[model samples]
Each structure stands twice: as structure tokens, then as C-alpha cells.
Target chain A: WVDCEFTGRDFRDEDLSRLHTERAMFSECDFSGVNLAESQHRGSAFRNCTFERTTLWHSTFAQCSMLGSVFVACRLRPLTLDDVDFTLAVLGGNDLRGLNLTGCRLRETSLVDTDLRKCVLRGADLSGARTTGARLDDADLRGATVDPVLWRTASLVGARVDVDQAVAFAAAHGLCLAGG
Target chain B: WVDCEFTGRDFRDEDLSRLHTERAMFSECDFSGVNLAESQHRGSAFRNCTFERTTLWHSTFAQCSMLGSVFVACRLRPLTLDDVDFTLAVLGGNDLRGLNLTGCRLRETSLVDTDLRKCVLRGADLSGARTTGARLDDADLRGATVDPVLWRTASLVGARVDVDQAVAFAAAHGLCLAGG
Candidate 1:
């Protein structure tokens, strides 16, 4: 494991794969195009780091603090992203396949063209979000308070929801009138 | 043209088609099932108004100030909605087909199942706005800072864009990755 002391250095186009870094502080560092495949980064502090084009395949970002970071063009595969705070981050165009984003607070975050296929969002709060072209295929949206119009476009193809949520969503889409 | 001030009245299931309203106020009014097809409303003020099952086809609403207004299960077809302010408005289940939304302020608005097919979105500031199940087919999205993931799922079919935005979006989703 290499220690960069959270220096404001650009890690672009560098292969940092097969390295295990524990409890490292990576503040204000640019990790664009750095391959961190199958590395153990448990309890890491990535505050204000740029993860552009970084391959985080099978790497654990568990219990990590990432305030004001940019994670553009990254590959995310099956990570535990629970209770993660992505406040004021620009996370555009990242593949979120198999990433479990349960109980995450994504305030003022922009996720443009991010594929949320088969992701679990049962208790996620998506209020005040700008979701223009994001796909929620097979996402669990039960017990979630979403805007009526955006929730209508949230594709429930191969997704399951409770009876009450189903009725609430249907009423918003003009399928059935409330109290009529 | 009938100048009816809907103050604290429930005008449900009433056909108000082809009526021209001038500077009319609808404070605390419930317009459920009111059909206003082909109506021309100029300089209307709808404060705390609720519309359920209303049809506003071919209507031109210019300089309308709708504060705390609600529209549910309505069809706003091809309407010229210029200088409209939907501040704190709950717009649910409205088919906004072919509506012109130039110079509109949609602050804290909830748009559920609102059809934005062929809608004009020039100079429209939609900051802090949330939508669900809304369609933007044939809508202009140039210089628009929206969610790319939501745009793909909302079926922006036949929408045009520049080459850079297309390449950036595709590259972010692993669509045009140069190397594996």
C-alpha cells in the first residue's frame, strides 16, 4: 500500500490495482483512471477526492466519508453503499450495476445516465432530485416518497411493491381517483 | 365568456368549455371534473386552487399566477402556458401535452405522470423540482442541466443533441469504452 498523505496530486492513468489500503485519508486527490480492482479499502476517508474514470470493481467503500467528491465515469460493482452521504457531488454517467444504495442520503447530488439496474432502494429518500434520464429497472421503490410525475416514469418492470404503494402510485398516474 | 370567481366553491363535474376568463381569481376553489376544453384564459390568478379530473385542451393561459394550485387527472393539451408561476403547486396526474413552458417558474413543484410531449422548455428554471413518470418526447433539452438517467427512461425518443453530450453520456455508461 502506498501513502500519498492526501496530497493534491493527480492519480490519472496510473494502475493502483492489487493494493490494499486501510483507513487511508485521501483528501482533495484526483483518482481519475486509476485501477483499484479487488482492493481492500475498508474504512477509508475519501473526502473531496475525484474518482473520474476509476475502476472500483469489487472494492469496498464501506463506512467511507466522501464529502464534495466527483465520481464521474466509474465502474461500480456490488458494493455496500449504505448510509453514505454524497452531499454536493457530481456523479454523472457511472455504471451502478449491483451496487446496494440502501439508506443513502443523496442531497443535492446529480446522477446523470447512471444505470441503477437491480439496485435496492426500499427506504431511500429521493426528494429534491433532478432525475432526467436515469433508469430504475427492477428497483424496489416501496415506502419511498417520490414526486408523482417522476415516480410514474420510474419503470417498475420486474420490480415488486406493496399494495398501498401500488395504489398510491396508480392514483398519481390517473389510473384511479383518490376517494372517488 | 363567464367571469366566475371560484372563491370557496366546489365546481365538480361542470363543463366550462370555450369560456374566456379575464383576471379571475380562484382562491380555495375545488374544480373537480370541470371540463374547460378550448378555453382561453388570459391574466388569471389561481391561488390555492385544486383541479381534479379537469380537461384544459387547446387553452392559452398567459400571465397566470397559480400559487398553491393543484391539478390532478387533467389534460393540458397544446396550451400556451407562458409566464406561469407554479410556486408551491402540487401538479399531479396532468397530461401536459404540447404545452409551451417558456419563462415559467416551477419552484417546489411535484409533477406526477405529467406528459411533457412536445413541450417548450426555453429559459425554464426547474431548480428544486421533482417529477415522476413524466414523458419528454420531442422536447428541447439543449443547455439543460438534468438527470441523464431519467431522460433515457422517460423515453426522449426522437430528441436531438450535440455530439459531445452524446459521447459523454454514452462513455459514462460503458457504452463506448475504448478499452475493456
Candidate 2:
């Protein structure tokens, strides 16, 4: 389905397993309860789509643009989001374990109660994101533009970050740099 | 020197070794670079005092009120500070390893790069305190009122906290309550 547009289509509880869709446009679509296991969506645009209770197990979203999308209670294991634009998206209550979101645009996104353990979020823009109750354990946040307020509210145990971020965090907490 | 007032006294670089004072008021006193090794102070009030680079080895400060005091680079080993009020104090670069700060008031205090390994901070009020690069390994912070911002900025590996605080921290990072 290359270059095909599925605007405002309802795909609720549909079995779309192993479907290949390259460079397709799915604007304002509803994918609630849809089984998209092992589906390949390369260079696709899912702008402002809703994906509630969607099963994206082993699905690939290579270079996809999911801008302003909402994903609630979705199972997104073994996913790939290389260069994906998720800006202003709402991804609350999603299980995104072990997913690689390198270079993803996540600015001003809502990630409440999301499981991002062991996920690769390198170079991701997390500025102004509401990450309350998000599990970021072992997440690679190096080169990510994280807001200080979000960093304070989130748990960064075992998370890897750059040297400059560490220095800035220390200064925010009133550390005298002369001794350290 | 019980009930004696030593306000505005300049004790800079004084050799106060083995000095014993009880129920004394030391408001606005300067104890910088003083050798206070083996000194015993009980029920003393040290408001707005400075103890910069002071040697407090084997010193005892039982039931002391050190409100708005500064203790930069002080040697506080083998010291006792039962029920001390350290509100708005500065304790930067102090070696506070294995110290028990139970019931201490440390609101808005500066704890930059302080070695707090194996320290018991139970019932301590560490709200709005700066703990950048402070070693909190094996520290017991149960019942302590520590700010969430400071907790995330500081190193909390092996640090113990209350159950409610842990739940709040997990919620802030998007961890599901059922699993975590």
C-alpha cells in the first residue's frame, strides 16, 4: 500500500498481521484493538492517529512520522522507531520495553505510566514532556534534551547520560564546584 | 561555661582542643580554622555561626541548635549531633560518613559533594537541600522529608527510603503499579 491514504478509517479489532505498508499515510485513523503483529510500516505517516489497545509486537516503524499521535494501553514490544517524529504525542499507559527510539522527536509528549525500561532514547527530544510515573531504568538518555523539571520528577536509576548533563544537574542542586 | 553568651566573638584559628562548654549561646560567632578536636558541647545554641575548615574530630554536640550555620570542609568524624537544628545551613564538602542525623532539621541546606555513605538520616527534614554529587550509598532515609527534585539529582544507589516515597518515584517514571 505504497503512497496510499487511509484518512479517518476505523481499524478496530482488525487482524492486520504481517501487512507491509511503505510510505502510506494514515491521518486521523483509529486503530483500537487492532492486531498489527510483525507489520512493516517503513516511511509511513500516522499523523494524529489513535492506537488504543493496539498490539504492535515485533512491528517495525522505520523512519515513520507519528506526529501528534495517541497510543493508550498499547503493547509495543520489539518495535523500531528510527528517526520517528512523535512530537506532541500522548503515549500514556503503554508498555514500550526494550524499544529503540533513537533520534525520535518526543518534545512536549505525555508519557505517563509508560514502561521505557532498557529502551534506547539516544538523541530524543524530551523537552517539556510530562513523564510522571514513567519507568526509565537503564534507558539510554545520552544526547537527549531533557528538561530539568522532568529530570527531577522522573527516576533515572541506571540511566546513562553525558558529562555535561551531570554537571548541569549538580549545579541545579546547589553544589559548589570548587571541591568537586 | 553554662548559660554564657559568646555573641560576636572572633575565634578564628583558635586552638580549642578538648574544650567543654554546656548550655552556652554562640550566636554570630566565627569558629573558622579552629582545632575543636575532642570538644564537648551540650545544650548549646550556635545560631548563624561559621565553622569553616574547623577540626571537629571526636567532638560531641548533644541537643545543639545550629540554625543558619555554615560548616564548609569541616572534619566531622566521631561527632555526635543528637536533635540538632541545621536549618538553612551550608555543609559543603564535609566528610559525614556513617553519621546518624535522626530528627535533624536540615531544610534548605547545602550538602554538595558530602560523603554520606552509610549515614542514617531518619526523620531528617532535607527539603529544598542541594545534594549534588553527595554519596548516599547505603544511607537510610526512612521517614525523611527529602524533596523529589533533590532525590533524583543525587545518587541514590543502595539508598533506602519510605514506601510512599518509593511509590511516588516510580509513578513519576511511568512504572505501572501492578508490576512494580
Candidate 3:
């Protein structure tokens, strides 16, 4: 489907596997308990959508807009995405481990209790995001937009950050920085 | 010598070992090149005294005023001291390691290059003291009136501090604390 509009559609517990869509709009759609396995979408808009208990295994979304979407208890393994606009997305209690979200727009995302371990978030924007109890260990946060709260609250024991982020982490850990 | 007064006296090269004097005044006295080993003084005043090249081995001073005194190249091992006022005293280049300076007043004292390694400075006032190049590794700074400058500048690799002081050190290290 190309440029197909599906507003307020409910796909609960439905299978959409191997489905391909381009420049499609699924605004305010309910994807609860939906099996979106192996689905591919490009330049699509899923704005303000719900994804509770949804399975997105092996799904690919390139240059897509998931802006303000809320995801809860979603199975998100092996999902392929790049430069997706997830700005203001609520991703609480999701296991997003080992995923590559490079250059994604995640500004102000609610990531409470999200398991992001070993995830590659390089160059992603996470500024002003609430990351309480988020497991970001071994995650690559280089060039990501983050503030002091993430460094102070996130469990990033083995996370990889750039030197500037390292300095921000150190400052958040209470080292009175004299110089670089 | 009870209430004795000896101002501006040149006691250079004098052997004042085991000399006991209480409540005496020895202002501006020069004890340079003197052997004051085992000398005992209590409630005495030695303000602005000079002690260069002096041997204060096994010397004991309690509640005495050594304010504004200058010590240089002195032998100070096995010295016994209690509540002595060393405010504004110059103790540069002295080896004062392993000594207990509990409750001593070292405010504004110049301790440049002094070896205070493993020294016990509990309840000591080191506020505003010039500690440039001071070796304070493993020193006890608990309850001491220390500032952030010492925390940031001193080589306190193994120094010990109490809870409040520990908080101060942590803040000095760049931890943005919320509470407790």
C-alpha cells in the first residue's frame, strides 16, 4: 500500500506479517496485541498510535514517524529501524535490548524501566527523556542528546559514551571539574 | 617558669631539651638550630617564633599558641601535641607524616610541600590553609574544617573523611546531589 490512510483503525490481535507499506498514515491506530512480524514500511506515519503487547519482530521501518506513540509491554526484538522519528514517544516497560536505533529522534521520550542493554543508540536524540530505572548497560550513547538526569538516574554501568558525555557523567557523579 | 615572659629572645642553637614551662610567654623567640627534644610546654605562648633546623623530637606541647611561627627543615618525629594553635604558621617542607594533629587549629597555615601522609587530622581546622604540594595520602580528614579547594587540589588518594565531609568531597567531585 502506498499513501494509504487508516485513521483510528484497530488491529488488535491481528497478524500483519510480511506486509509492506510506503508513505502510509495510521494515525491514532490501536495496534494492541497485534503480530506485526516481518512487516516492512518506509516513509510512513504512525503518529499517536498505541502498541500494547504488540510483537514487532523482524519489522523494518525506514524514515518513519512514530511521533507521540505509546508502547507498553511490546515485544520489539530484531526490529530494523534507522532515522525514525520517535520524538515524544512513550516506551515504558519495553525490552529494546540489542537493537540499533542509530540517529533516531527520541527527544523527550518516556523510557521508564525500559531495558536498552547493548542497544546501539549512537547519534540518537534523547534530550529531556525520563530514564528512571532504564537498563542502558553496554548501550552506545555516543553523540546522543542527554542531560544530567539520565547520567544520574539511568543504570548505565557499561554504556559507551563519547568523551564529552563521559565528562557529563563524571560531573553528574559529583566530580568538581576543573578543566577538560 | 610560671607566667614568665621572654619576648624577642634569641635562643638559637640552645639545648632546651626536656624543658618544662607552663603559662609562659615567648613571643618572637628564635629557636633556630635549637635542640628542643622532649621539651614540655603547657598553656604557653610562642607566637611568631622561628624554629628553623630545630629538633623537636619527642617534644610535647598542649594548648599552646604557636601562632604565626615559622618551621623549616625541622626534625619533628615522635612529637606529642594536643590542641595547639598553628594558625598562620609556616610549616613548608616539613615531614609531619603519621602524626596525630587532632583538634589543632591550622587555619591560614602554610603547609606547602609538607608530608602529611597517613597523618591523623581529625577535628583539625584546615580551612583556608595553603596546602600546595602537600602529601596527604591516607590522612584522616574527618571532622576537619576543610574546603573544596583541598578536595579538588590535594593528593588524597587514600584519605579518610566522615559522612558530611564525604558528602562535601563528593560534591567537590561533581556529583549533583538531590538529598542525603
Candidate 4:
């Protein structure tokens, strides 16, 4: 789909494997029970789209935006996400363990109850990301941008973070570090 | 010894078992390598006394003062201690685990590297006590008075403390609690 617009369209139970999209928009689209495996999207947007019971295995997205998209009962393992923005996307209750989300923009994304253990999120922008009940144990979040709520909301035991992130967590737990 | 003054006396390696002393003063006394088992001291003073390698098993000290006393290499599990003062005393490098030291005065006492795991120290005054390298895991310190230095230097992984002590520990770790 090159420069195509599939707004308010229903692609339920469809096999969109190896799909190549460029400058395309899937606004308010329904992709329930869909197989989006090995798909590649560049400069495309999936605004306010639904992806229930979807399989996005090995999918690649570059410079793509998924604002306000909802993904329920989806099993995903992204291949590449170069500068992809997932602002306001609901990716709750997903198991993304051991996945690499380096440099990904997940600002304000709902990741509630998500199992992100042992994932590499280095340099990822997770500012205002809803991490309530999220399992981030052993996840490497070094140099990642996170907010104070992430410290109190998520399970960050054994997670690796930089000094600045450590400072924020300490503050969130009502600790006052001495001597700078 | 009844109302006796044994100042600067040398009682090294002596068997002082069942030694009952009442209102006796043993100032600057040398009790090194002495066997003081089953002894009882009431209203007596042991100021500036040395108890190196001393065996004080099953000993009792009621209303006694042990100010400035040094107890190095002593293995003690006291039987009864009613108002016994241990101010400015050095009881360092001792293994006193599982001891019940309720209401004991340990002000300014040096307990460096002491193992006090599972000890019941309820209502004990440990203010200004040197707890550097001390192991206090699972010790009950409820209603006990402790300084801020203990929170940082001692091993209190499973220690039980009061609400006020919890506040002090949080402050020691640079925490600023909100909402009182």
C-alpha cells in the first residue's frame, strides 16, 4: 500500500504478512484476529486503530506513528522500530519479555500489566508511559527517559538504569540522597 | 567482696566463679583471661575494667555500673541484668546473636562488627552505639533508641524497628515522605 488511506476499514482475520506500506494511513481501522507478520511500514500512521487478537511477529516499522492505537490480546515481537512513535497507544497485558526497544518513543503509551522483563529499553523515551503493574524486572533501561510515576508503578526489581534514573527512583520512594 | 575497693588489681587468668560482690568497686582492674561464670554483682561498679578473653556465661549484674569497661574476646550471654549500665564500653567483635537485651543501657557503647542477628533488643537504648559492620538482621528493635548512623552502617536487612525509627532510617537514606 503506497500512499494509501484505509480509514475506518475492517480487516478482521486477514493475513497481511510481508505487507509493505509507505506514506500510508490506517486511521480508525480494525485489524482484529489479523496476521501482520513480516510486515514493513515506513512513514505510515495507524492512528486510533484496533488490533485485538493480532499477531505482529517480526514486523518492522520505521518513522511510523501509532497514536491512540489499542492492541488487546496481541502477541508482538517487533523486528525494528527506528524512530517509531507510539504515543497514546494502549499495549496493555502484553508479554514483550527479552525484546529490544532501543530508541523507541513510547510517550504516554498505556503499558499496564505488561510483562517486559529482561527487555532492552536503552535510550527509549518512556516518559509518562503507563507502567502500572508492569513487570520490568531485569530490563536494561540505561539512558532511557522515564518519569517519576514509573518508579512507583512498575516492578523494577533487578532493572538496570543510569544514575539519573536511580535518583528519580530514590526520590519517588521518599529517599533523600546526601552529598550529591 | 563486700564494699571492697580493688583498684588497679591484676586478676588475670583467675577463676572468679560464683564470685558474689556487693557495693564493691573494681576500678581500672585487669580481669584478662578470667573465668567469671555464675558470678553475681549487685550495686557494684566496674569502671575502666578490662575483661579480655573473659567468660561471663550465666553472670548477673543488678543495679551495677560498667562504665568505660572493655570486653574484648568475651563470649557473653548474660542471665540477668537489671539496670546495668554499659556506657562508653567497648564490646566489639562479639557474636551476641539471639540475645534478649530488653531495656539494657548501651549508650556510647562500641559494638563494631558485632553479630546480633535475631536478637531481641526491644526498648534498649543504643544511642551513639558504634554499629559499624554490625549484623543486626532480624533483630527486634521496637521502642529502642537508636541514632541515624545505625541506619547507614549496620546490616538491618530484616530488623524490626518502630515508626519513629523507620522515619529516621528513611531520612538517613535521603527520603522525603509526603502526606505526613
If both were scored by DockQ, which would come out higher, candidate 1 or candidate 2? 2
TM-score of each: 0.45, 0.53, 0.55, 0.56
| Per-residue C-alpha lDDT of model 3 across residues A61-168, encoded as one tens digit per residue | 988999989999988998899658888899998999999988888888889999999898888888888899998887878777888888878876556665556546
Chain B TM-score against the true chain B, each candidate: 0.74, 0.91, 0.95, 0.94
Best by lDDT: 3
CAPRI-style docking class of model 2 based on DockQ: incorrect
Against the true two-chain complex, what DockQ does each candidate achieve?
Answer: 0.02, 0.05, 0.05, 0.05
Which candidate achieves the best TM-score against the true structure?
A: 4
lDDT of 2 by residue, B139-162 (tens): 777778887676566776667665
**Candidate 1 TM-score, C-alpha based:** 0.45
* Tens-place lDDT digits, model 2, residues A1-180: 898999889888899999999999999999999999999988999999999999888888888888888998888887766677888889888888888887788888889988898888878898888999888887877778887676666776777665555544433333322222
Which runs in model 1 stand beyond 4 Å of their true positions?
A1-7, A171-180, B1-180
Greater-lDDT candidate between 1 and 4:
4
Q: Give the CAPRI class of candidate 1.
A: incorrect
Give one digit per residue, the lDDT tens place, for model 1 in B9-34. 78878888887888888889888889
DockQ of 3: 0.05
Cα lDDT, all candidates: 0.66, 0.80, 0.84, 0.83
**Residue B108 displacement in candidate 1 (angstroms):** 42
